[PDB]
Structure formats: C-alpha cells, structure tokens
Amino acid sequence: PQITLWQRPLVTIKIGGQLKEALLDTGADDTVLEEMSLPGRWKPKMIGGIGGFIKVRQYDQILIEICGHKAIGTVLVGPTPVNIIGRNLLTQIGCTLNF
Amino acid sequence: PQITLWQRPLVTIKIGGQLKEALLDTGADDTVLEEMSLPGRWKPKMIGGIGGFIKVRQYDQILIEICGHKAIGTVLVGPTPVNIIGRNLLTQIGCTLNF
Ligand SMILES: COC(=O)[C@@H](NC(=O)[C@@H](NC(=O)[C@H](C)N1CCC([C@H](C)NC(=O)[C@H](C)N)=C[C@@H](Cc2ccccc2)C1)C(C)C)C(C)C
Numbered sequence: 178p179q180i181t182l183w184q185r186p187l188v189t190i191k192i193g194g195q196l197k198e199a200l201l202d203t204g205a206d207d208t209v210l211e212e213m214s215l216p217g218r219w220k221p222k223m224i225g226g227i228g229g230f231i232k233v234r235q236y237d238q239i240l241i242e243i244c245g246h247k248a249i250g251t252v253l254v255g256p257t258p259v260n261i262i263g264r265n266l267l268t269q270i271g272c273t274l275n276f
Numbered sequence: 277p278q279i280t281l282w283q284r285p286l287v288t289i290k291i292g293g294q295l296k297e298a299l300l301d302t303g304a305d306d307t308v309l310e311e312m313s314l315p316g317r318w319k320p321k322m323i324g325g326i327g328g329f330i331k332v333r334q335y336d337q338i339l340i341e342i343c344g345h346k347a348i349g350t351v352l353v354g355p356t357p358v359n360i361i362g363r364n365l366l367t368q369i370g371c372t373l374n375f
Contacts, residue, residue, distance in 0.1 A: 180373040182363045186302050201373055203285050204301030204360060209326065227308070227356050228328030246375070257326050261303060264281045272375035274279040274300055276345070276366075 178244075190262065191242040192252070197260055199243075203274055205263030208241075209233060209253045224253060231256050246270040277343075278374075289361065290341040291351070296359055298342075302373055304362030307340075308332060308352040323352065330355050345369040 180186045186201040193215050199208075207224060219234040233255030240249050243262060248269035279285045285300040292314045306323060318333035332354030339348050342361060347368035 178375070182302060182366050182371060182373070185305070185363075186373055200303050202301070202303030203281060203373075204299045204303050204358075206284070224326070225357070226327040227323075227325030227360075228330055231327050244375075258324070259303075261326075264284075267375070268281050270375050272281065272373060274281070274285050274302070274371060275374055276277070276343075276369045276371035 188244040188262070190244075190260070192239065199260035199262045201267065201272070202261050202263050203267065205261045206265065207253055207261070207263040208250065208266050209255060209257045209261040209263070211257050211260055212254055215239065215252070215254055219254075222253065224255075241266065243270050287343045287361075289343075289359070291338065298359035298361050300366065300371065301360045301362050302366070302371075304360050305364065306352055306362045307349065307360060307365050308354060308356045308362070309359040310353070310356055312353055314338070314351075314353060318353075321352065332356075340365060342369050 187198045190199045219236045222235045223230045233253040237251045239252040248266045318335045321334040322331045332352040334352050338351045347365045349365045
C-alpha cells in the first residue's frame with residue numbers, strides 16, 4: 178500500500194504465533210522487538226541507538242509476516258519501547274521510500 | 277525520487293548555510309541533528325530513543341532544504357549519532373512508504 182506519514186506507520190505482524198503492531202522504520206538497519214516468547218537458541222548482542230546501547234538476544238531465521246507478506250531474517254528481542262521493523266526485512270517485503 | 281533500502285536512505289540537507297547528510301527516518305516523529313552552529317533562541321527539551329533519553333536544544337521555524345525541497349520546521353540539535361529527518365519534515369517534502 179502507499180503510507181503517508183502524517184501518523185506513525187504501524188502495521189500488524191504475525192511472529193511466533195502472536196499478533197503485534199510494529200513501526201515501519203527506514204532509519205533502523207535491524208528489526209528490534211520487545212521481549213516476547215520466541216522458540217529456539219539465540220546470541221547476545223548490543224545494538225546502539227540515540228539514547229545509548231541496549232543488550233538484546235539475537236534470533237536468526239525467524240519467519241515473520243508483515244502486513245500479509247512473509248519474510249525470514251534476524252530479529253533482535255529486547256528492551257525496545259516500540260517494535261521496530263528495520264531495513265533487513267523492509268527490503269524483503271519490497272518496501273521503498275518515495276518523494 | 278524513489279529510494280530502495282539495501283543501503284541507508286541518506287540524503288543531502290542544507291541548513292544554516294552548512295551542507296550535511298541525514299537519514300530519512302520514518303520511525304522518528306522528530307528531526308534531530310548533530311551538534312551545530314545555528315543562530316537563535318532555542319528551548320531545552322529531552323527526547324527518547326532505545327537505550328534512553330538525550331537532552332536536546334529545540335529550535336522552531338528553521339529552513340532546511342532536503343534534496344533541494346525547502347521545508348520550515350522544528351529541528352532538535354544535540355548528541356545524536358546520525359542526523360535524523362523524522363516525520364514532521366517528511367510530510368512536507370511529500371515522502372511515502374510503498375510496498
Ligand atoms: C544502530 O542500529 C539500529 O538500526 C538502531 N537504529 C537507530 O537507533 C537509528 N535511529 C532510529 O531508528 C530512529 C531515529 N528512532 C530513534 C528516536 C525516535 C524519536 C526521535 N523519538 C520520539 O519521537 C520520542 C517519542 N519523543 C524514535 C525511535 C523509535 C522509538 C519510539 C518511541 C520510543 C523510543 C524509540 C526510532 C539510528 C541511531 C541509526 C535500532 C536499534 C532501532
């Protein structure tokens with residue numbers, strides 16, 4: 178769809194059996210999601226952001242359905258305020274920026 | 277133009293007679309630039325990102341030329357890593373998300 182930006186660009190995702198709303202973020206390289214129950218093994222990592230750095234669990238090859246399109250990639254689960262869908266997955270569902 | 281997302285969406289802005297480069301961020305509600313010499317009166321404000329909170333100087337009514345397009349808005353200048361063009365200016369240059 179075409180999404181104008183007079184409101185936050187949130188979209189429903191289906192991840193690990195659960196339904197969530199995540200923000201479409203072109204300024205984020207990675208997908209970072211708030212703490213939730215995910216199947217499997219993971220590696221600790223520390224991602225940087227504007228207020229500093231947070232420690233996250235890294236899950237690779239996690240299937241996620243962003244507004245009906247399916248994608249498989251790495252998801253970082255941690256202390257994020259909002260669920261962030263970053264550029265490693267937006268490229269997969271074919272998303273572009275236009276002006 | 278149309279921007280795909282395999283690389284960061286960085287564009288050239290002209291602000292306060294200085295040439296800068298900045299991230300086109302759909303996920304940010306506000307625009308926040310690195311520390312710079314800018315004339316005027318500003319107000320103390322503090323914003324959040326992941327990792328936490330930074331104190332910034334907010335300035336209203338500043339002209340920014342984002343890839344040639346002129347826009348007048350609120351710009352926050354402070355200790356950010358990258359310069360971020362958030363939704364208050366992105367709606368002015370007509371930017372939309374497509375997929
Ligand atoms: C560096 O690796 C990454 O890709 C990280 N990327 C970033 O932090 C990048 N920035 C962003 O994604 C943008 C600017 N953004 C940060 C500030 C930001 C805006 C400026 N904050 C606000 O408007 C608050 C509500 N006043 C929102 C972030 C999402 C969010 C929402 C609510 C509370 C906290 C965070 C998203 C830059 C620093 C490379 C991910 C952790 C998101």
